[PDB]
């Protein structure tokens, strides 16, 4: 069985991509996470995203599909992890500060607390300097 923390953590990722709450992530709904983090999707490659994990075949995303998706770089691929890290690294300095990092998390819907952008800083931060660089962002965004 899952931890409830674990249930929980799940349940905050649905979420930001289901934004109307119903229970299916739509093109749409895919569409505009994708487009937050700095992508231009075609609602034909959405289609496709979402097909590649379409067990049921309804169209559209649902909780046990959005966990094979999460388990399964191809999307992650270099022009999209670029395109993440410029949504982060706001004021382009080529750094992810903690203020940038809680900043825009939060533009995304996540709600961290400072121990967990803290947190999240530290495990990804391989010189030590307190911030992301690229190669860090890459890690961070690929881990697990
Ligand atoms: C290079 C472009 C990119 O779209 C960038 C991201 C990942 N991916 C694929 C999309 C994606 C994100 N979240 C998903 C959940 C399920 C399926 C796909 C996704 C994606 C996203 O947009 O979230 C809505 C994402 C995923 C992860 C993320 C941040 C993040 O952006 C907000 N982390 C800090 C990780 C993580 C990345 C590495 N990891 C693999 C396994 C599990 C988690 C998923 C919950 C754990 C993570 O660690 C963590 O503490 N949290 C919560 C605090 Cl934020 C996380 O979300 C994801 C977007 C590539
Ligand atoms: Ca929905
Ligand atoms: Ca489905
Ligand atoms: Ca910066
Ligand atoms: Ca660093």
Known sequence: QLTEEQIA??????SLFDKDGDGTITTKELGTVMRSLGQN??????????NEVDADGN????????????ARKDTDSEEEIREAFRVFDKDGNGYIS???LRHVMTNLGEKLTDEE???MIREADIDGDGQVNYEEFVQMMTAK
Do not use: C, N, Y
């Not at 999707?41 to 979402?50: K, S």
């Not at 169209?59 to 999460?70: K, V, Y």
């Open 9 to 14: 953590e799940f349940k905050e990722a649905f």
């Open 41 to 50: 999707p075609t609602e034909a490659e959405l289609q496709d995203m979402i």
């Open 59 to 70: 169209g559209t995303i649902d909780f046990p599909e959005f966990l094979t998706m999460m």
């Open 98 to 100: 903690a203020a940038e």
């Open 117 to 119: 952008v803290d947190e």
